[PDB]
Amino acid sequence: SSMKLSFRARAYGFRGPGPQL
């Protein structure tokens, strides 16, 4: 899982838009 940008996201911090997904 890394920096694609069409995600929920899941695990990182600041999520949906969520780097590093």
Swiss-Prot record:
Top-rank taxon: Eukaryota
Methionine sulfoxide modification, residue list: M3
As stated in the Swiss-Prot or TrEMBL entry, residues carrying the post-translational modification Phosphoserine are S2
- What is the recorded function of this protein according to its Swiss-Prot or TrEMBL entry? Inhibits catecholamine release from chromaffin cells and noradrenergic neurons by acting as a non-competitive nicotinic cholinergic antagonist. Displays antibacterial activity against Gram-positive bacteria S.aureus and M.luteus, and Gram-negative bacteria E.coli and P.aeruginosa. Can induce mast cell migration, degranulation and production of cytokines and chemokines. Acts as a potent scavenger of free radicals in vitro. May play a role in the regulation of cardiac function and blood pressure.
By what name is this protein known? Catestatin
Instruction: Give the lineage.
Output: Eukaryota, Metazoa, Chordata, Craniata, Vertebrata
Quote the gene name from the UniProt entry.
Answer: CHGA
Full-sequence range covered: 370 to 390 of 457
